Design a protein around this ligand. Structure first.
Ligand SMILES: CO[C@@H]1O[C@H](CO)[C@@H](O[C@@H]2O[C@H](CO)[C@@H](S[C@@H]3O[C@H](CO)[C@@H](O[C@@H]4O[C@H](CO)[C@@H](O)[C@H](O)[C@H]4O)[C@H](O)[C@H]3O)[C@H](O)[C@H]2O)[C@H](O)[C@H]1O
Ligand SMILES: *[C@@H]1O[C@H](CO)[C@@H](O)[C@H](O)[C@H]1NC(C)=O
Length: 364
């Protein structure tokens, strides 16, 4: 079915069984404290995005979640539940990263692999047209074209990132779908020197895709820890005037809008509850200490440019291993402000989950 306006309005957000199963089968059994177990049980019901970060998730997790939502909706959910999904499998993924877990390479049929990926997701979404579906498109992709074109892998991947983003925006432009392209965070693209070129890039992509109706705007702070709005700039933000997501979005949207893209925003707050964080530098993204679960997902943001506060990166799922000998070890995960020992990216990290619980704001 079609919708008008903010896709988060008039629906409830589904909390998926993948995350719920991590909490119940992996987290809770390691927790003996009654209060923390009850808090954990509660966090399992908070509706976070489900990531299609590996091809195998398409015909498993995506189908499962949409099937489960349809079942719940047909069983009388009111209002109806909506899905929240991340598309995250570009070839030569994370081009500026020290290490990537992306499975596909441009040199190894990655373009065709990705197009097939998008085409299968399209088929599944059509099959589940009765479940409104909100997508985040490719974290850590086009933000690299703004600042990291000096990196050979990024320069070599740029035309592919662009073409394939346009491909996804057109192929997933379906009436029951909404899309938000990733747009980094205040401490990446919000810096004054970066913000106009970022607006130029995103608005051009939007134009080049034919301004598809399903595209609502942009997603910010995905997998990061920034504040939505705080009175004093965290120390590691200096000297950025855009020291929180509200400042970034208020500066960014007029630039985008003048360029033909009046983007609405969704802002990750899943690990933003504690401010300031334990990050020693803004760019320390990996398993940062001193962070907490943040404000609960809601369409009622109170801000004219923000369609929803969301939990995109699910807290407790590791950002990367701290084992320096591991094949895909990223040195950011070995820093003094990265919690250790940490398992491989995407694996449950229980000590990190407990940290997020203890620092939760609002508390569980
Ligand atoms: C006054 O001029 C400005 O000075 C400041 C301070 O020196 C400059 O700040 C620096 O901006 C850089 C970007 O231009 C970033 S690097 C940026 O960091 C982010 C994380 O915050 C990286 O994205 C993450 O990438 C990970 C993989 O490596 C992903 O796993 C993760 O999901 C992403 O968030 C990004 O790739 C990097 O390019 C510096 O941290 C910051 O100090 C500013 O540039 C000057 O204009
Ligand atoms: C991706 O998964 C699909 C099934 O959803 C499969 O048909 C395809 O072969 C997989 N892609 C690659 C490159 O292995």
């Amino acid at each position: 079915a079609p919708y008008n306006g903010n896709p988060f309005e008039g629906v409830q957000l589904w909390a998926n069984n993948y995350y719920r199963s991590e909490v119940h089968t992996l987290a809770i059994p390691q927790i003996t404290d009654p209060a923390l177990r009850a808090a954990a049980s509660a966090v399992a019901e908070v509706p976070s995005f489900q990531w299609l970060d590996r091809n195998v998730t398409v015909d498993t997790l995506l189908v499962q979640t949409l099937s489960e939502i349809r079942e719940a909706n047909q069983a009388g959910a009111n209002p109806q539940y909506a899905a929240q999904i991340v598309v995250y499998d570009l070839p030569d993924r994370d081009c500026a990263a020290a290490a990537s877990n992306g499975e596909w390479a441009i040199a190894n049929n990655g373009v065709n692999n990705y197009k097939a990926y998008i085409n299968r997701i399209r088929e599944i979404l059509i099959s589940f047209s009765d479940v409104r579906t909100i997508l985040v498109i490719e974290p850590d992709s086009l933000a690299n074209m703004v600042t990291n074109m000096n990196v050979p892998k990024c320069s070599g991947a740029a035309s592919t990132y662009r073409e394939l983003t346009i491909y996804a925006l057109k192929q997933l432009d379906l009436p029951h779908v909404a899309m938000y392209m990733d747009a980094g965070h205040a401490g990446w693209l919000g810096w004054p020197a970066n913000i106009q070129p970022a607006a130029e890039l995103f608005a051009k992509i939007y134009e080049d895709a034919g301004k598809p109706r399903a595209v609502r705007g942009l997603a910010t702070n995905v997998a990061n820890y920034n504040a939505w709005s705080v009175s004093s700039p965290p120390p590691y933000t200096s000297p950025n005037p855009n020291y929180d997501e509200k400042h970034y979005i208020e500066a960014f949207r007029p630039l985008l809008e003048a360029r033909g893209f009046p983007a609405q925003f969704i802002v990750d707050q899943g690990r933003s509850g504690k401010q300031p964080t334990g990050q020693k530098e803004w760019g320390h993204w990996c398993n940062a200490i001193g962070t907490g679960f943040g404000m609960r997902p809601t369409a009622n943001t109170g801000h004219q440019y923000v369609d929803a506060f969301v939990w995109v990166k699910p807290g407790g799922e590791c950002n990367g291993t701290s084992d320096t000998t591991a094949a895909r070890y990223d040195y950011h995960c070995g820093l003094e402000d990265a919690l250790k020992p940490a398992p491989e990216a995407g694996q449950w990290f229980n000590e990190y989950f407990i940290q997020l619980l203890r620092n939760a704001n609002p508390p569980f």
